Design a protein around this ligand. Structure first.
Ligand SMILES: CC(C)CCC[C@@H](C)[C@H]1CC[C@H]2[C@@H]3CC=C4C[C@@H](O)CC[C@]4(C)[C@H]3CC[C@]12C
Ligand SMILES: COc1cccc2c1cc([N+](=O)[O-])c1c(C(=O)O)cc3c(c12)OCO3
Lengths: 281, 232, 338, 225, 56
C-alpha cells in the first residue's frame, strides 16, 4: 500500500508541474501576442479558453490533494465533498467540452466532404461550436443530478450507520468524461480519413504529420489508461485505500498531457517553445 | 415615381377593410412607408409607419391595436389592414414614401389616395393663420408654431412643409425647415428658431393656391397643423 | 537629325538646371530655421468605420466635411457619415478592382475607377432612391489611378497609360488628353482654384498641367522612384509628392524646383497617400510601414505618428474644415483622427 | 437615447447595409479567386475558353464551387503597381506554351520566348505579394510540342539539356526548370499540368488544385502548418 | 521615325525653359506667411475645444 501511494503521489506532483508549465506557456504566449498587437485567430482564442480551464482544473485538483495531506482536518466534511465535487464537475465539463469544441473547429475547417449537412456545419463553425457548448448543458445537468444523487445516498447511509460511494461517483464522472473524449476521437479519425482520401485523390491526379503522430499516440495512451482505471474501479479491489490519489492523478492526467500535445501540434506554440529553448541556451 | 392606392369605398361601421398602395418607379425596399389620412373637410393625420426591412412599426394612438401595416417588398406594395372601423376613420388615405439617411428627403411623394366612407403627451402644432387672401406677385409668410422646440441635439430642426393644391395630393416643399425639396421653385423658403416657424413665398403664382401643412418629425407620433388656406 | 535633336534637348535641360540653380539662393530650411517648431502632434482615433471586408484602396472626403466615400476590393463604395458611423450608401461596383474614388464638390456624384480602365460616375441624388451609374467613361488604355471632379460635369482622370484625361460627364468624351509622362501616372491633385492640376507618375517626375489649354506648363524631377501620392498646397502655389524612395518632397510652382525633402533614416517603406492640412503647415503621409507620419511642411521634422493600422495605409484625406484626418488602410478599416 | 426619429431610422438603414455587406462578404469568401497569367502567345485564351478593357472576369461553377478568373494580360502597364491588388487570390494559373521553345519574340531576336516565359514565372512566383499563393502551372500547346520536338531539338532553348528528343524527356525537363525556378518551395507549391485544345480535364485539375490550396489554407488558419 | 517625338520633346523643353521664375526665398516666405496667417484656422495644428469638435 505504501509504495503505490508514494509512486502515485510522485506522479501527481509531476503532472501538476508539467500542467502548470504547459498551460502557463499557452496563456503567456497568447497574452504576449495580444498585448504586442500580433495577429489573433479563432484557434488561439479557443486555446486560451481551454488552457485557462485546464489550469483551473489542475489547481483545483492540487488544492484537493494538499487539503488531503497538508491540512487533513476538513476532509471529514460531507459538505466540502459536495462543494469540491460539484465545482470540479462544472469546470471539468466545460474544459473537456471546450476541447471537443476545438476538435470541432479543426474538423469543420480542415476536413472536406460532400454530405450537405457537413457543409452546413462547415460554413457556421462558430455557431456550431457555441451551439454544441450550449446543448451539452443537458449532459452537465444530468451529470450534476447523478453525482448529487450518489453523494446524497452516501450521506444518508453514513448518517444511518467512504471509498465505495467515492468509487461509484468516480465511475459516473469517468463515463461523463469518456463521452466527449469518444466524440473527439471519432472526429479526429474522420479528419484523418478525409486527409487520406484527399492524398489518394491527388496521388491519382497530381503530386504536421509529426503532430498527428503525437496526437494519435496520446489518444491511444489516454484511452488505454482511462479504460484500465474505469475497469479497476468497477471491479478490482485493493485500490480503495489509494483510490483518492489515483482518482486525482487520473483527473489531472488529461489537462497536462493534452496541453503538451496541443503545444507540439500547433505551429505558433511550437515556434514559441523553440524560441524559449533557444533563449535558455 | 407612382404610388397608386386601392381599396376604399363604403364600409359598414365596425367592419373591416384592407388598403393597398401599389408602388412603381422607385426602390420600394429602401424606402420607409407612411399612411396619412384626411377627413372630408379637415386636415391630415398620421396613421402608421413601417421602416425599410419592416424592422420598425409605429402606429398612431387613434389606430393603435385596431390597424396593422405590412409591406410585400418583392411585390412592391404597401398594406394597411383595418379592423373595427368607426366614423372617425372616414378619411382619404394617402400612402407616403420616406427615405432616411444623412441629407435625405423624407415625405417626397404622396399618392393619389383612396376615400374610405364609414356610414353612421404628443407635440401639437398650431397654424392660427387659417384662411388667408392672396394675390399674384405678393409675398406671404405662413406661420406655424410648435408646442415644444423641434430643434434637436444633432442641430437638425425637424419641421416639414407640405402643399395641398385643390384636388391634389400633398407635395413636399421644405424639409428640416431650411431645405428646398427637389422640383420645388426657389420662391419658397423656411425659417424659424425652434418653436416658431415661417414659410415665405417671395413671388406668388396661381400654382401656390392651396392649403399648407406643417409637420414634425422629432417624435414619431407625427402631428400636422390645421392648414392655412391661401385663396386668390 | 536625331543626334542634333538629342544634343538640343540636353542643352535645354542644362539651361533649365542652370535657371533653377540661379533662382535658388537660400533653401527653405534656412528661411524657416527661426520659426517656432510645431510640437509633438498627438492624434487619437475618434472614429472607426467598420464594414469593409477587403483592402481599402481609396477614400475621398466630401466638401461638407462630413460625408466620406471609401473604395475597397470587396466591390463596394460605402458613403460614410463620419460624425455618426452610418453607411449612407453601399454602391455595388461592377468591377471589384477599384484603386480610386472621388466625391463631387456638389455631393451629387461619386466616381470610382481601377483596373477596368473605366471611371464610373455614380448618381446619389436620384428620384428612385438608389445610387445608379450616371456615366461610364472609357478610353483610357491603362488602369485608373486617380480621378478628381472639376465640377458636376467635368472630371480629370489619371491612368497607367502615361496619360491624364479631362472628360465631359454629359457627353462621356475626352475633352482633352494630357501626354508627356513616361511612366504610369499614379496620383493627381486639382488646384484650389481648379485652374491647374499636378500629376505624379512612375517616371519619378511631377508635371503641372493647364486644364483649359491642355499642355504641360512645368515639370519637376527630384525623386528616385515612382511617385504614388501627390497633393496640392492650400495656397495653390505649391504641392507635395510621395514616392517609393521613402521620401516626401515639396515642389514650388513659381521657383520650379523642390523646396524641402521629408526623409528619416528609419523610414524605409514608401509613401502611398499624401494630404496637406488646412493651413498647409502639416503634411500627413501614409506609408507602407502600417503608419502615417505627420510632417511639418516648413521644417523637415516629424510632428507625430498616426499608428493604429494593422496593414499598409493606402489612402489619406483631410477635411476641408481641417477637423478630421481619415487614413483607411488595407486592414479594411477607416479611422477618423483628430 | 438622444437620437431623433430620423437618426434612429438612419441607424436602421446602416444596420441593413451592414447585414447586406456581411452576406456579400460571406458569399465572396466561399468563392475561388484565380489569377490568370501568361506571356503573350501562351494559350491563356484557350484556357479561358475551355473553362468558361483592362481585366476580363470569367466566372464559372464546377462541383458546387464558384470560381472567379481574372485575366490581366490586357493591362499593358507596370505590373508592380497593381499586382498587389491580387494578393490573396486562391491560386495563380500560369500558362506557358511548350511550342515557344523554338520561337523567338518579334523584338530582341537574341532572346527566346520560352526564356521570357521563364522570366515572368520567376518574377511572379517569387514576388513578395505571392509567397503562399500556389501556382497552377499549365504547359499548353503540347501537340505542337510533339510535332516540333519530333524535328527540332530542345538544345536551342536550353543548351545545357542533354536527353532524348522524345516527348517525355523534354517535357519533364521543361517542367523541372519551371519548378526549380521557385525559390520558396517551403511555403508555396507549383501544380503542373499538360494541356492542349482537345482537353476536357483542365477544369477538374484546377478544381483539385484549388481544393488542395483551400485545405492547406484551412490548416494554416487552424495553425497546424 | 522618332524624329517627331524628339521635336515634340524639344518644343516642350523650349516652353518650359522660357517661363518666369521667382527666387526660392520669395516662395519660402510666401509659404511661411500663408501657414502663419491660417495657423488659427487649423484644428490639427491647434486642437479645438471638445465642445467645437464634432468627433467627440
Ligand atoms: C479522468 C476522467 C476519467 C474523469 C474522472 C475524474 C476522477 C478520476 C476524479 C477527478 C476529481 C476527483 C474528486 C476530487 C475530490 C474529491 C474529494 C474527496 O474527499 C473524495 C473524492 C473526490 C470526490 C474525487 C473523486 C474522484 C474524482 C471525480
Ligand atoms: C497536430 O494536432 C492535430 C492535427 C489534426 C487534428 C487534431 C490535432 C490535435 C488535436 N488535439 O487537440 O489533440 C485534435 C483534437 C483534440 O484532441 O482536441 C480533436 C480533433 C482533431 C485534432 O482533429 C479533429 O478532431
Amino acid at each position: 500500500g505504501g509504495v503505490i501511494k508514494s509512486i502515485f503521489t510522485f506522479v501527481l506532483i509531476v503532472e501538476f508541474i508539467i500542467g502548470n508549465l504547459g498551460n502557463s506557456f499557452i496563456a503567456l504566449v497568447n497574452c504576449i501576442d495580444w498585448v504586442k498587437g500580433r495577429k489573433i485567430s479563432s484557434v488561439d482564442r479557443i486555446l486560451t479558453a481551454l488552457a485557462i480551464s485546464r489550469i483551473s482544473l489542475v489547481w483545483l485538483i492540487f488544492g484537493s490533494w494538499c487539503v488531503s495531506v497538508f491540512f487533513p482536518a476538513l476532509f471529514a466534511t460531507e459538505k466540502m465533498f459536495r462543494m469540491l465535487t460539484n465545482i470540479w464537475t462544472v469546470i471539468n465539463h466545460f474544459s473537456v467540452w471546450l476541447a471537443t469544441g476545438l476538435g470541432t473547429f479543426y474538423f469543420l475547417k480542415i476536413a472536406n466532404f460532400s454530405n450537405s449537412i457537413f457543409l452546413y456545419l462547415k460554413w457556421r463553425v462558430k455557431k456550431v461550436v457555441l451551439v454544441l457548448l450550449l446543448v451539452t448543458s443537458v449532459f452537465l445537468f444530468l451529470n450534476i443530478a447523478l453525482i448529487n444523487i450518489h453523494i446524497n445516498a452516501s450521506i444518508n447511509g453514513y448518517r444511518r450507520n467512504f471509498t465505495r460511494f467515492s468509487s461509484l461517483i468516480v465511475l459516473t464522472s469517468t463515463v461523463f468524461i469518456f463521452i466527449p473524449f469518444t466524440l473527439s476521437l471519432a472526429m479526429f479519425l474522420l479528419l484523418i480519413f478525409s486527409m487520406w482520401k484527399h492524398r489518394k485523390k491527388m496521388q491519382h491526379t497530381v503530386k504536421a504529420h509529426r503532430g498527428v503522430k503525437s496526437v494519435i499516440t496520446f489518444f491511444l495512451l489516454y484511452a488505454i489508461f482511462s479504460l484500465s482505471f474505469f475497469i479497476s474501479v468497477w471491479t478490482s479491489e485493493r485500490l480503495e485505500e489509494n483510490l483518492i490519489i489515483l482518482s486525482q492523478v487520473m483527473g489531472m492526467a488529461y489537462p497536462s498531457c493534452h496541453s503538451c500535445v496541443l503545444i507540439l501540434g500547433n505551429k505558433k506554440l511550437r515556434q514559441a517553445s523553440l524560441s524559449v529553448l533557444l533563449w535558455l541556451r | 415615381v407612382q404610388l397608386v392606392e386601392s381599396g376604399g369605398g363604403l364600409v359598414q361601421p365596425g367592419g373591416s377593410r384592407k388598403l393597398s398602395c401599389s408602388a412603381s418607379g422607385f426602390a420600394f425596399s429602401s424606402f420607409g412607408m407612411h399612411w396619412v389620412r384626411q377627413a372630408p373637410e379637415k386636415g391630415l393625420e398620421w396613421v402608421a409607419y413601417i421602416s425599410s426591412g419592416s424592422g420598425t412599426i409605429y402606429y398612431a394612438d387613434t389606430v393603435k391595436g385596431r390597424f396593422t401595416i405590412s409591406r410585400d417588398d418583392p411585390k412592391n406594395t404597401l398594406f394597411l389592414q383595418m379592423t373595427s372601423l368607426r366614423s372617425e376613420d372616414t378619411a382619404m388615405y394617402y400612402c407616403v414614401r420616406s427615405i432616411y439617411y444623412y441629407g435625405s428627403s423624407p415625405f417626397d411623394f404622396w399618392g393619389q389616395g383612396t376615400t374610405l366612407t364609414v356610414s353612421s403627451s404628443d407635440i401639437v402644432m398650431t397654424q392660427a393663420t387659417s384662411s388667408v387672401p392672396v394675390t399674384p406677385g405678393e409675398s406671404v409668410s405662413i406661420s406655424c408654431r410648435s408646442s415644444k422646440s423641434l430643434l434637436h441635439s444633432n442641430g437638425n430642426t425637424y419641421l416639414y412643409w407640405f402643399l395641398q393644391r385643390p384636388g391634389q395630393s400633398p407635395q413636399l416643399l421644405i424639409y428640416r425647415m431650411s431645405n428646398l425639396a427637389s422640383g420645388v421653385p426657389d420662391r419658397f423658403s423656411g425659417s424659424g428658431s425652434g418653436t416658431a416657424f415661417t414659410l415665405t413665398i417671395s413671388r406668388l403664382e396661381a400654382e401656390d393656391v392651396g392649403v399648407y401643412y406643417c409637420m414634425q418629425h422629432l417624435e414619431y407620433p407625427l402631428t400636422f397643423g390645421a392648414g392655412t388656406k391661401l385663396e386668390l | 537629325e536625331l543626334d542634333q535633336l538629342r544634343q538640343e534637348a540636353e542643352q535645354l535641360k542644362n539651361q533649365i538646371r542652370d535657371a533653377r540653380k540661379a533662382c535658388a539662393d537660400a533653401t527653405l530650411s534656412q528661411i524657416t530655421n527661426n520659426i517656432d517648431p510645431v510640437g509633438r502632434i498627438q492624434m487619437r482615433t475618434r472614429r472607426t468605420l467598420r464594414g469593409h471586408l477587403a483592402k481599402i484602396y481609396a477614400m475621398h472626403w466630401g466638401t461638407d466635411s462630413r460625408l466620406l466615400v471609401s473604395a475597397s476590393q470587396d466591390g463596394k463604395l460605402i458613403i460614410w457619415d463620419s460624425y455618426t458611423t452610418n453607411k449612407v450608401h453601399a454602391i455595388p461596383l461592377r468591377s471589384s478592382w477599384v484603386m480610386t474614388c472621388a466625391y463631387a464638390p456638389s455631393g451629387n456624384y461619386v466616381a470610382c475607377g481601377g483596373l477596368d480602365n473605366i471611371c464610373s460616375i455614380y448618381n446619389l441624388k436620384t428620384r428612385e432612391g438608389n445610387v445608379r451609374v450616371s456615366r461610364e467613361l472609357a478610353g483610357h488604355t491603362g488602369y485608373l489611378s486617380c480621378c478628381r471632379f472639376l465640377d458636376d460635369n467635368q472630371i480629370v482622370t489619371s491612368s497607367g497609360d502615361t496619360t491624364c484625361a479631362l472628360w465631359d460627364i454629359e457627353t462621356g468624351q475626352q475633352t482633352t488628353t494630357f501626354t508627356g509622362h513616361t511612366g504610369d501616372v499614379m496620383s493627381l491633385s486639382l488646384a484650389p482654384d481648379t485652374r491647374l492640376f499636378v500629376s505624379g507618375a512612375c517616371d519619378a517626375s511631377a508635371k503641372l498641367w493647364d486644364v483649359r489649354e491642355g499642355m504641360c506648363r512645368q515639370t519637376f524631377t527630384g525623386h528616385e522612384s515612382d511617385i504614388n501620392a501627390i497633393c496640392f498646397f492650400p495656397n495653390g502655389n505649391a504641392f507635395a509628392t510621395g514616392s517609393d524612395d521613402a521620401t516626401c518632397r515639396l515642389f514650388d510652382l513659381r521657383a520650379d524646383q523642390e523646396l524641402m525633402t521629408y526623409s528619416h533614416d528609419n523610414i524605409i517603406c514608401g509613401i502611398t497617400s499624401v494630404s496637406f492640412s488646412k493651413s498647409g503647415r502639416l503634411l500627413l503621409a501614409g506609408y507602407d510601414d502600417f503608419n502615417c507620419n505627420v510632417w511639418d511642411a516648413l521644417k523637415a521634422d516629424r510632428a507625430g505618428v498616426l499608428a493604429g493600422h494593422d496593414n499598409r495605409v493606402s489612402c489619406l484625406g483631410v477635411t476641408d474644415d481641417g477637423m478630421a484626418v481619415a487614413t483607411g488602410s488595407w486592414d479594411s478599416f477607416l479611422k477618423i483622427w483628430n | 437615447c438622444t437620437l431623433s426619429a430620423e437618426d434612429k431610422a438612419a441607424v436602421e438603414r446602416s444596420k441593413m447595409i451592414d447585414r447586406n455587406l456581411r452576406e456579400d462578404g460571406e458569399k465572396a469568401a466561399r468563392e475561388v479567386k484565380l489569377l490568370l497569367l501568361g506571356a503573350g502567345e501562351s494559350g491563356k485564351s484557350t484556357i479561358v475558353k475551355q473553362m468558361k478593357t483592362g481585366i476580363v472576369e470569367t466566372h464559372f461553377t464546377f462541383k458546387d464551387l464558384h470560381f472567379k478568373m481574372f485575366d490581366v494580360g490586357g493591362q499593358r502597364s507596370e505590373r508592380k503597381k497593381w499586382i498587389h491588388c491580387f494578393e490573396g487570390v486562391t491560386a495563380i494559373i500560369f500558362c506557358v506554351a511548350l511550342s515557344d521553345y523554338d520561337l523567338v519574340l518579334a523584338e530582341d531576336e537574341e532572346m527566346n520566348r520560352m526564356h521570357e516565359s521563364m522570366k515572368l514565372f520567376d518574377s511572379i512566383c517569387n514576388n513578395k505579394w505571392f509567397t503562399d499563393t500556389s501556382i497552377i502551372l499549365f504547359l499548353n500547346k503540347k501537340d505542337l510540342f510533339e510535332e516540333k520536338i519530333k524535328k527540332s531539338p530542345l538544345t536551342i532553348c536550353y543548351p545545357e539539356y542533354a536527353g532524348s528528343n522524345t516527348y517525355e524527356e523534354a517535357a519533364a525537363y521543361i517542367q523541372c526548370q519551371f519548378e526549380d525556378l521557385n525559390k520558396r518551395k517551403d511555403t508555396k507549391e507549383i501544380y503542373t499540368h499538360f494541356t492542349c485544345a482537345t482537353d476536357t480535364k483542365n477544369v477538374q485539375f484546377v478544381f483539385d488544385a484549388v481544393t488542395d490550396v483551400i485545405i492547406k489554407n484551412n490548416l494554416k488558419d487552424c495553425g497546424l502548418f | 521615325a522618332s524624329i517627331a517625338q524628339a521635336r515634340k520633346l524639344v518644343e516642350q523643353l523650349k516652353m518650359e525653359a522660357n517661363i518666369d521664375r521667382i527666387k526660392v526665398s520669395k516662395a519660402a516666405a510666401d509659404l511661411m506667411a500663408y501657414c502663419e496667417a491660417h495657423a488659427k484656422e487649423d484644428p490639427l495644428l491647434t486642437p479645438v475645444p471638445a465642445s467645437e469638435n464634432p468627433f467627440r
